[PDB]
Amino acid sequence: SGKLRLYKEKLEGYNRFYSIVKTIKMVTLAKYRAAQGRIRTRDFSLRYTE
Amino acid sequence: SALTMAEYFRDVEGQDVLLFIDNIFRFTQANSEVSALLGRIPAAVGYQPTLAEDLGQLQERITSTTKGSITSVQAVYVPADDITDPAPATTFSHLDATTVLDRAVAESGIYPAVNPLECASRIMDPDVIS
Amino acid sequence: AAKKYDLFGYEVDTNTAPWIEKIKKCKYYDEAGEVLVNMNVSNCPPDIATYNATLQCIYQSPSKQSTPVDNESKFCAMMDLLEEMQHRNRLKPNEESWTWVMKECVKSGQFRLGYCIQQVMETECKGCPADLVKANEANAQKAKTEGKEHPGHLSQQAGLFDVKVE
Amino acid sequence: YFMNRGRHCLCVYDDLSKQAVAYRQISLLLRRPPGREAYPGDVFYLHSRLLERAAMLSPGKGGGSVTALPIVETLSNDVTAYIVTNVISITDGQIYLDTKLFTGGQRPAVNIGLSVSRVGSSAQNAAMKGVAGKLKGILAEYRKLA
């Protein structure tokens, strides 16, 4: 019925929102993994800057 | 009665007559108003069980024949903007073209408020149109 | 000689000689197909000999029916029968069936199908008959000389915008 | 008639929804006990006895067959309706058409995720079977990546 379809489309919109957020999660996780190497390469440039 | 007039103009004369109706839903509503009194149990949403046949007879009478032609345009009311209602659901199958209107589109200032995605037409084939 | 039990263990009638005789006596191979249907109804499953007799009836028959039928092909009918026999009955075709198919291809003049059947016979059976191979080669050479090696519109040259896609 | 005579038939129905409506109308006019959506309790039995008549007869019975392709319409993708649920449960698989894909241009608009064939790959030809064995996985991977 009308209310049933209202709730159904609300659920579908929430599912779409979840999928989009999952995609951006994957993107940001890829970027984080790419940039994580800075840890092993940092903390040895600003020695005399101190 | 109006359909009988059009049928006469179609057969006894041989014209291409236009037939505008506003609104068909009132026919089904009126029949439902009296179904129970006649002694017929309500079927669904409160509509009378004989809705399908009652509407189909009239829709079939509304058609183009060999003698003449009838171009019919019928307004259809969708209660609470709920297209799943049995009367519109039955009406969908007795038409060549359907134009669906959206309250959201109307609110957005677009007039006519037409949803092409839900709209349809039979002659949308390359053989008929360019 | 030995009983054969059906899917559910019920026996079947292995006496198919009367049906083979009926097939040989038929005129149009559609009648032979009807006979096979009757055998299936009567629980007398066709055997390799029955299928070969059906193929012979197809080869020797005038046409599919008394009245012409558009796009009829004895080769297609026999290939369908072979598929039904091998896949839906678990029966390996014998050399007789392939020889009948090659004879039909030669009679029709389909040299390409003759080549394919020759390759199939060489692969599975013990080679293809020399007479049939020579007849197929002669038909191919005749077509080449007459100019019917390939269709015409295919040879016709068409550009990107010239192809008249209907 | 053909099935019992060792031949193969294809019965198409368009559509069971209106048949159900007609049966409901008849029952309500005849004062029979209704049920969900006012469809009496015999609707499921009606559809079951209509569809079970489609079968693949055994070799000893003639070898004939009947294939059933009933058609059903869902309102705004309301697949939970009584008739749709009954028919889906009865049938040996479904082919789902999607309005989104139909408008997008995929014609036919089959939605593979919502479409299934309980029979499986046993009904495919050998070459088609082998091709599909890889095609199905390829499509699954493409969907997962998309």
Coordinates of C-alpha atoms in Angstrom, one line a residue:
Chain A
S1 CA 0.0 0.0 0.0
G2 CA 1.0 3.7 0.2
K3 CA 2.6 3.6 3.6
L4 CA 4.2 0.2 2.8
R5 CA 5.8 1.6 -0.4
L6 CA 6.9 4.7 1.6
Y7 CA 8.8 2.6 4.0
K8 CA 10.1 0.5 1.1
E9 CA 11.5 3.5 -0.8
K10 CA 13.0 4.8 2.5
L11 CA 14.8 1.5 2.8
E12 CA 16.0 1.6 -0.7
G13 CA 17.3 5.1 -0.3
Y14 CA 19.1 4.1 2.9
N15 CA 20.7 1.1 1.1
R16 CA 21.9 3.4 -1.7
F17 CA 23.4 5.7 0.9
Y18 CA 25.1 2.7 2.5
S19 CA 26.6 1.6 -0.8
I20 CA 27.9 5.1 -1.6
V21 CA 29.4 5.4 1.8
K22 CA 31.0 2.0 1.3
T23 CA 32.5 3.1 -1.9
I24 CA 34.0 6.2 -0.4
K25 CA 35.3 4.0 2.5
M26 CA 37.1 1.9 -0.1
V27 CA 38.6 5.0 -1.8
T28 CA 39.8 6.5 1.5
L29 CA 41.2 3.2 2.6
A30 CA 43.2 2.8 -0.6
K31 CA 44.5 6.3 -0.1
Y32 CA 45.4 5.6 3.5
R33 CA 47.2 2.4 2.6
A34 CA 49.1 4.3 -0.1
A35 CA 50.2 7.1 2.3
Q36 CA 50.9 4.9 5.3
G37 CA 54.5 4.4 4.1
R38 CA 55.3 7.8 5.3
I39 CA 55.7 6.4 8.8
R40 CA 58.8 4.4 7.9
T41 CA 60.2 7.4 6.1
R42 CA 59.5 10.3 8.4
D43 CA 61.0 11.6 11.7
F44 CA 64.5 12.0 10.1
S45 CA 64.1 15.2 8.0
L46 CA 63.5 17.9 10.7
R47 CA 66.6 17.0 12.8
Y48 CA 68.4 20.4 12.4
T49 CA 65.0 22.2 12.1
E50 CA 64.7 21.6 15.8
Chain B
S1 CA -24.7 7.4 -22.8
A2 CA -22.0 9.5 -24.3
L3 CA -20.3 6.4 -25.6
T4 CA -23.5 5.4 -27.3
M5 CA -23.5 8.9 -29.0
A6 CA -20.0 8.4 -30.1
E7 CA -20.7 4.9 -31.4
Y8 CA -23.5 6.2 -33.5
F9 CA -21.3 8.9 -34.9
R10 CA -18.7 6.3 -35.7
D11 CA -20.9 3.6 -37.3
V12 CA -23.9 5.3 -38.9
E13 CA -21.8 8.2 -40.2
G14 CA -18.2 7.0 -40.5
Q15 CA -16.3 9.8 -38.7
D16 CA -13.0 10.2 -36.8
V17 CA -14.6 11.4 -33.5
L18 CA -12.8 12.6 -30.4
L19 CA -14.0 11.5 -27.0
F20 CA -12.8 13.2 -23.8
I21 CA -13.8 11.9 -20.4
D22 CA -13.3 13.5 -17.0
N23 CA -13.2 11.5 -14.8
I24 CA -13.6 7.7 -15.3
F25 CA -12.7 6.9 -11.7
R26 CA -16.1 8.2 -10.6
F27 CA -17.8 5.4 -12.5
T28 CA -16.0 2.7 -10.4
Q29 CA -16.6 4.8 -7.3
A30 CA -20.3 5.0 -8.0
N31 CA -20.5 1.3 -8.6
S32 CA -18.7 0.6 -5.3
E33 CA -21.1 2.9 -3.5
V34 CA -23.9 0.5 -4.4
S35 CA -22.1 -2.9 -4.5
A36 CA -22.8 -3.7 -0.9
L37 CA -26.4 -2.5 -1.0
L38 CA -27.0 -4.8 -4.1
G39 CA -25.5 -7.5 -1.8
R40 CA -22.0 -8.0 -3.2
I41 CA -19.2 -8.4 -0.7
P42 CA -16.3 -5.8 -0.9
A43 CA -13.3 -7.2 -2.6
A44 CA -10.2 -5.1 -2.1
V45 CA -9.6 -1.6 -0.8
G46 CA -13.4 -1.5 -0.7
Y47 CA -13.9 -1.7 -4.4
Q48 CA -16.6 -4.0 -5.9
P49 CA -15.5 -7.4 -7.1
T50 CA -16.9 -6.8 -10.6
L51 CA -14.6 -3.8 -11.2
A52 CA -12.5 -5.7 -13.8
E53 CA -15.5 -6.7 -16.0
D54 CA -17.4 -3.5 -15.5
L55 CA -14.5 -1.4 -16.7
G56 CA -13.5 -3.8 -19.4
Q57 CA -16.9 -3.7 -21.1
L58 CA -16.8 0.1 -21.3
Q59 CA -13.2 0.2 -22.4
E60 CA -13.8 -2.3 -25.2
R61 CA -16.9 -0.4 -26.4
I62 CA -14.5 2.6 -26.6
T63 CA -12.5 1.6 -29.6
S64 CA -12.0 2.3 -33.3
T65 CA -13.7 0.1 -35.8
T66 CA -13.7 -0.5 -39.5
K67 CA -16.5 1.9 -40.2
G68 CA -15.3 4.9 -38.1
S69 CA -12.5 5.8 -35.7
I70 CA -12.6 7.0 -32.1
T71 CA -9.8 8.8 -30.3
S72 CA -10.4 8.5 -26.6
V73 CA -8.7 10.6 -23.9
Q74 CA -9.7 9.7 -20.3
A75 CA -8.6 11.4 -17.1
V76 CA -7.8 9.0 -14.2
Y77 CA -7.7 9.8 -10.5
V78 CA -5.2 8.0 -8.4
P79 CA -6.3 8.1 -4.7
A80 CA -3.6 9.4 -2.4
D81 CA -1.3 9.3 -5.4
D82 CA -1.2 5.5 -4.9
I83 CA -0.9 4.0 -8.4
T84 CA -1.2 0.5 -7.0
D85 CA -5.0 1.0 -6.5
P86 CA -7.0 -1.7 -8.3
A87 CA -8.9 0.7 -10.5
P88 CA -5.9 2.4 -12.1
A89 CA -4.1 -0.9 -12.2
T90 CA -6.9 -2.4 -14.3
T91 CA -7.2 0.8 -16.4
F92 CA -3.5 0.6 -17.4
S93 CA -4.0 -2.4 -19.6
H94 CA -6.9 -0.9 -21.5
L95 CA -5.0 2.0 -23.0
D96 CA -2.6 2.7 -25.9
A97 CA -0.8 5.7 -24.2
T98 CA -0.4 6.7 -20.5
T99 CA 0.7 10.0 -19.1
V100 CA 1.6 9.8 -15.4
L101 CA 1.7 13.0 -13.3
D102 CA 3.8 13.6 -10.2
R103 CA 3.1 15.9 -7.3
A104 CA 6.8 16.3 -6.7
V105 CA 7.2 17.5 -10.3
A106 CA 4.3 19.9 -9.9
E107 CA 5.8 21.3 -6.7
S108 CA 9.1 21.8 -8.5
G109 CA 7.3 24.3 -10.7
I110 CA 7.4 22.1 -13.9
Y111 CA 4.1 22.2 -15.8
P112 CA 2.9 19.9 -17.2
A113 CA 4.1 17.6 -14.4
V114 CA 4.9 14.5 -16.5
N115 CA 7.2 11.6 -15.5
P116 CA 8.5 10.3 -18.8
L117 CA 10.0 7.3 -17.0
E118 CA 6.6 6.1 -16.0
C119 CA 5.0 7.3 -19.2
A120 CA 4.6 4.8 -22.1
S121 CA 3.2 4.5 -25.6
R122 CA 2.6 1.6 -28.0
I123 CA 3.6 3.5 -31.2
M124 CA 7.1 4.2 -29.9
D125 CA 8.6 1.8 -32.4
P126 CA 10.7 2.8 -35.4
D127 CA 8.3 1.2 -37.9
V128 CA 5.5 3.7 -37.0
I129 CA 7.3 6.9 -36.1
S130 CA 10.5 8.4 -37.6
Chain C
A1 CA 18.6 -61.3 -25.7
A2 CA 19.1 -59.3 -22.5
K3 CA 16.4 -57.3 -20.7
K4 CA 16.8 -53.6 -20.4
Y5 CA 15.3 -51.7 -17.5
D6 CA 14.0 -48.1 -17.7
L7 CA 14.8 -45.2 -15.5
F8 CA 12.7 -46.7 -12.7
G9 CA 13.7 -50.3 -13.2
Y10 CA 10.8 -51.3 -15.4
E11 CA 11.7 -53.4 -18.4
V12 CA 11.2 -52.3 -22.0
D13 CA 10.4 -54.0 -25.3
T14 CA 13.6 -54.6 -27.3
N15 CA 11.7 -56.0 -30.3
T16 CA 11.9 -53.1 -32.8
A17 CA 12.0 -55.1 -36.1
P18 CA 8.3 -54.3 -37.0
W19 CA 8.9 -50.6 -36.4
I20 CA 12.1 -50.7 -38.5
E21 CA 10.1 -52.4 -41.3
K22 CA 7.4 -49.7 -41.0
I23 CA 10.1 -47.0 -41.2
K24 CA 11.6 -48.6 -44.3
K25 CA 8.1 -48.8 -45.8
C26 CA 7.4 -45.1 -45.1
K27 CA 7.5 -42.4 -47.8
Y28 CA 8.2 -39.1 -46.0
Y29 CA 10.7 -39.1 -43.1
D30 CA 8.2 -37.2 -41.0
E31 CA 6.2 -40.4 -41.0
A32 CA 9.4 -42.2 -39.7
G33 CA 9.5 -39.6 -36.9
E34 CA 5.9 -40.3 -36.1
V35 CA 6.8 -44.0 -36.0
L36 CA 9.6 -43.2 -33.5
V37 CA 7.1 -41.3 -31.4
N38 CA 4.8 -44.2 -31.5
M39 CA 7.6 -46.5 -30.3
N40 CA 8.4 -44.2 -27.4
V41 CA 4.7 -44.2 -26.5
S42 CA 4.6 -48.0 -26.7
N43 CA 7.8 -48.4 -24.6
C44 CA 10.0 -49.8 -27.4
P45 CA 13.0 -47.4 -27.3
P46 CA 14.7 -46.9 -30.6
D47 CA 18.1 -48.6 -31.1
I48 CA 21.1 -47.8 -33.3
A49 CA 19.7 -50.0 -36.1
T50 CA 16.4 -48.1 -35.9
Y51 CA 18.2 -44.7 -36.1
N52 CA 20.2 -45.9 -39.1
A53 CA 17.0 -47.0 -40.8
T54 CA 15.5 -43.6 -40.1
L55 CA 18.5 -41.9 -41.6
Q56 CA 18.2 -44.2 -44.7
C57 CA 14.5 -43.3 -45.0
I58 CA 15.4 -39.6 -44.7
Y59 CA 18.1 -40.0 -47.5
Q60 CA 15.8 -41.9 -49.8
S61 CA 12.6 -39.9 -49.2
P62 CA 11.5 -37.3 -51.7
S63 CA 10.7 -34.5 -49.2
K64 CA 9.6 -33.8 -45.7
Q65 CA 5.9 -33.9 -46.6
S66 CA 3.6 -34.3 -49.6
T67 CA 3.4 -30.5 -49.7
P68 CA 6.6 -28.4 -49.8
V69 CA 8.0 -27.1 -46.5
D70 CA 10.1 -23.9 -46.5
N71 CA 13.8 -24.2 -45.6
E72 CA 13.6 -28.0 -45.1
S73 CA 16.9 -29.8 -44.9
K74 CA 17.6 -33.6 -44.7
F75 CA 21.0 -32.8 -43.3
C76 CA 19.5 -30.7 -40.5
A77 CA 16.9 -33.4 -39.7
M78 CA 19.6 -36.1 -39.6
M79 CA 21.9 -34.0 -37.4
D80 CA 19.0 -33.4 -35.0
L81 CA 18.3 -37.1 -34.9
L82 CA 21.9 -37.8 -34.2
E83 CA 21.9 -35.3 -31.3
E84 CA 18.8 -36.9 -29.9
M85 CA 20.4 -40.4 -30.1
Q86 CA 23.8 -39.5 -28.6
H87 CA 22.8 -37.0 -25.9
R88 CA 19.3 -37.9 -24.8
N89 CA 19.7 -41.7 -25.2
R90 CA 23.5 -42.4 -24.7
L91 CA 24.0 -44.2 -28.0
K92 CA 27.1 -43.7 -30.1
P93 CA 26.5 -43.2 -33.8
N94 CA 28.0 -45.9 -36.1
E95 CA 29.8 -45.5 -39.3
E96 CA 26.6 -46.2 -41.3
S97 CA 24.9 -43.0 -40.0
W98 CA 27.9 -40.9 -40.9
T99 CA 28.1 -42.5 -44.4
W100 CA 24.4 -41.7 -44.9
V101 CA 25.1 -38.1 -43.8
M102 CA 28.0 -37.7 -46.2
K103 CA 25.9 -39.2 -49.0
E104 CA 23.1 -36.7 -48.3
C105 CA 25.7 -33.8 -48.3
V106 CA 27.1 -35.0 -51.7
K107 CA 23.7 -35.4 -53.2
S108 CA 22.7 -31.9 -52.0
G109 CA 26.0 -30.4 -53.2
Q110 CA 27.0 -28.9 -49.9
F111 CA 30.7 -29.4 -50.3
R112 CA 31.6 -27.6 -47.1
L113 CA 29.4 -29.8 -45.0
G114 CA 30.9 -32.7 -46.9
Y115 CA 34.4 -31.6 -45.8
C116 CA 33.2 -31.3 -42.2
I117 CA 31.6 -34.7 -42.2
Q118 CA 34.8 -36.1 -43.8
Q119 CA 36.9 -34.7 -41.0
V120 CA 34.4 -36.0 -38.4
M121 CA 34.6 -39.5 -39.9
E122 CA 38.4 -39.4 -40.0
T123 CA 38.4 -38.4 -36.4
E124 CA 35.9 -40.9 -35.0
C125 CA 35.2 -43.6 -37.6
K126 CA 37.9 -45.2 -39.8
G127 CA 38.1 -42.6 -42.5
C128 CA 35.7 -41.3 -45.1
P129 CA 34.7 -43.2 -48.3
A130 CA 37.0 -42.3 -51.2
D131 CA 34.0 -42.2 -53.6
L132 CA 32.2 -39.7 -51.5
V133 CA 35.3 -37.6 -51.0
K134 CA 35.9 -37.4 -54.7
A135 CA 32.3 -36.5 -55.4
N136 CA 32.5 -33.7 -52.9
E137 CA 35.7 -32.4 -54.4
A138 CA 34.2 -32.6 -57.9
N139 CA 31.2 -30.6 -56.7
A140 CA 33.4 -28.0 -55.1
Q141 CA 35.5 -27.6 -58.2
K142 CA 32.4 -27.3 -60.4
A143 CA 31.0 -24.6 -58.1
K144 CA 34.4 -22.8 -58.2
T145 CA 34.5 -22.9 -62.0
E146 CA 30.9 -21.8 -62.4
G147 CA 31.5 -18.9 -59.9
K148 CA 29.2 -20.1 -57.1
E149 CA 32.1 -20.6 -54.6
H150 CA 30.7 -18.0 -52.2
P151 CA 27.6 -15.7 -52.0
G152 CA 27.5 -12.5 -54.0
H153 CA 26.6 -9.8 -51.5
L154 CA 29.5 -11.0 -49.3
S155 CA 32.0 -10.4 -52.2
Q156 CA 30.4 -7.0 -52.8
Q157 CA 32.5 -4.2 -51.4
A158 CA 30.8 -2.0 -48.8
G159 CA 32.2 0.9 -46.9
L160 CA 31.4 2.1 -43.4
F161 CA 28.4 4.2 -44.4
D162 CA 27.5 2.0 -47.4
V163 CA 26.3 -1.0 -45.5
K164 CA 22.5 -0.9 -45.9
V165 CA 21.6 -2.1 -42.4
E166 CA 17.9 -2.8 -42.5
Chain D
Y1 CA -3.0 -33.5 -26.3
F2 CA 0.5 -33.3 -27.9
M3 CA 2.4 -34.0 -24.7
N4 CA 0.8 -37.5 -24.3
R5 CA 1.6 -38.2 -28.0
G6 CA 5.4 -37.7 -27.7
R7 CA 5.6 -34.1 -28.7
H8 CA 6.6 -30.8 -27.1
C9 CA 4.4 -27.9 -26.3
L10 CA 4.9 -24.3 -25.1
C11 CA 1.9 -22.8 -23.2
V12 CA 2.1 -19.1 -22.7
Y13 CA -0.3 -17.3 -20.3
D14 CA -1.0 -13.5 -20.3
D15 CA -1.8 -13.4 -17.5
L16 CA -2.6 -15.2 -14.3
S17 CA -3.3 -12.0 -12.4
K18 CA -6.6 -11.4 -14.3
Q19 CA -7.5 -15.1 -13.9
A20 CA -7.1 -14.7 -10.1
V21 CA -9.2 -11.5 -10.2
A22 CA -12.0 -13.4 -12.1
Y23 CA -11.9 -16.3 -9.7
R24 CA -12.1 -13.8 -6.8
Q25 CA -15.1 -12.0 -8.4
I26 CA -16.9 -15.3 -8.9
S27 CA -16.3 -16.5 -5.4
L28 CA -17.4 -13.3 -3.8
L29 CA -20.5 -13.2 -6.0
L30 CA -21.3 -16.8 -5.0
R31 CA -20.7 -16.0 -1.3
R32 CA -17.7 -18.1 -0.7
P33 CA -15.3 -17.5 2.3
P34 CA -12.5 -15.1 1.2
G35 CA -9.0 -14.7 2.6
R36 CA -6.0 -12.5 2.2
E37 CA -6.8 -9.7 -0.3
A38 CA -10.2 -11.4 -0.5
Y39 CA -8.8 -14.1 -2.7
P40 CA -10.3 -17.3 -1.4
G41 CA -8.1 -20.1 0.0
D42 CA -8.4 -22.1 -3.2
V43 CA -6.3 -19.7 -5.3
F44 CA -3.0 -21.5 -4.4
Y45 CA -4.6 -24.9 -5.3
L46 CA -5.9 -23.5 -8.5
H47 CA -2.5 -22.2 -9.7
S48 CA -0.8 -25.4 -8.4
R49 CA -3.1 -27.7 -10.4
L50 CA -2.8 -25.4 -13.4
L51 CA 1.0 -25.5 -13.4
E52 CA 1.7 -29.0 -12.3
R53 CA 0.2 -30.2 -15.5
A54 CA 3.4 -29.0 -17.2
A55 CA 5.9 -31.8 -16.9
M56 CA 8.6 -33.8 -18.8
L57 CA 7.0 -37.2 -19.3
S58 CA 9.1 -40.4 -18.9
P59 CA 10.4 -42.2 -22.0
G60 CA 7.9 -45.0 -21.6
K61 CA 5.0 -42.5 -21.5
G62 CA 5.8 -41.0 -24.9
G63 CA 8.6 -38.6 -24.1
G64 CA 6.5 -35.5 -24.7
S65 CA 6.7 -32.3 -22.7
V66 CA 4.9 -29.1 -21.8
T67 CA 6.7 -25.9 -21.0
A68 CA 4.9 -23.2 -18.9
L69 CA 5.7 -19.5 -19.2
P70 CA 3.1 -17.7 -17.0
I71 CA 3.4 -13.9 -16.8
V72 CA 2.9 -11.8 -13.7
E73 CA 2.8 -8.1 -13.1
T74 CA 3.9 -6.5 -9.8
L75 CA 2.8 -3.0 -8.7
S76 CA 5.7 -0.8 -7.9
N77 CA 7.9 -3.8 -7.4
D78 CA 5.6 -5.3 -4.7
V79 CA 6.7 -8.9 -5.1
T80 CA 5.3 -9.7 -1.6
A81 CA 1.8 -9.8 -3.0
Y82 CA -0.2 -13.0 -2.3
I83 CA -0.5 -14.2 -5.9
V84 CA 3.1 -13.3 -6.8
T85 CA 4.4 -15.2 -3.8
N86 CA 2.3 -18.2 -4.5
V87 CA 3.3 -18.4 -8.1
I88 CA 7.0 -17.8 -7.4
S89 CA 7.0 -20.6 -4.8
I90 CA 5.1 -22.9 -7.3
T91 CA 7.3 -22.3 -10.3
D92 CA 10.7 -23.8 -11.2
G93 CA 12.4 -20.4 -11.4
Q94 CA 11.6 -16.8 -12.4
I95 CA 12.7 -14.2 -14.9
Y96 CA 12.6 -10.7 -13.4
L97 CA 12.2 -7.6 -15.6
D98 CA 13.3 -4.3 -14.2
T99 CA 11.9 -0.9 -15.2
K100 CA 15.1 0.8 -14.3
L101 CA 17.1 -1.3 -16.8
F102 CA 14.3 -1.1 -19.4
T103 CA 14.4 2.7 -19.3
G104 CA 18.2 2.6 -19.2
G105 CA 18.3 0.7 -22.5
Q106 CA 18.9 -2.9 -21.5
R107 CA 16.1 -4.5 -23.6
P108 CA 15.3 -7.1 -22.5
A109 CA 15.6 -5.7 -19.0
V110 CA 16.3 -9.0 -17.2
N111 CA 17.8 -8.6 -13.7
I112 CA 20.1 -11.5 -13.3
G113 CA 20.3 -11.2 -9.5
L114 CA 16.5 -11.4 -9.3
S115 CA 16.2 -14.1 -12.0
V116 CA 16.9 -17.8 -11.4
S117 CA 16.3 -21.2 -12.9
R118 CA 16.0 -24.0 -10.3
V119 CA 16.4 -26.6 -13.0
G120 CA 20.0 -25.4 -13.5
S121 CA 22.6 -26.1 -16.2
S122 CA 21.2 -29.6 -17.0
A123 CA 18.8 -28.0 -19.5
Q124 CA 21.6 -26.3 -21.5
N125 CA 23.2 -27.7 -24.5
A126 CA 26.8 -28.9 -24.2
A127 CA 28.4 -26.0 -25.9
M128 CA 26.0 -23.5 -24.2
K129 CA 26.7 -25.3 -20.9
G130 CA 30.5 -24.9 -21.3
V131 CA 30.2 -21.3 -22.3
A132 CA 27.8 -20.4 -19.5
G133 CA 30.0 -22.1 -16.9
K134 CA 32.5 -19.3 -17.4
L135 CA 30.1 -16.5 -18.4
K136 CA 28.2 -16.7 -15.2
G137 CA 31.3 -16.3 -13.1
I138 CA 32.5 -13.4 -15.4
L139 CA 29.2 -11.6 -14.9
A140 CA 29.4 -12.2 -11.1
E141 CA 32.9 -10.7 -11.0
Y142 CA 31.8 -7.7 -13.1
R143 CA 28.8 -7.1 -10.8
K144 CA 31.0 -7.3 -7.8
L145 CA 33.5 -4.8 -9.2
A146 CA 30.7 -2.4 -10.4

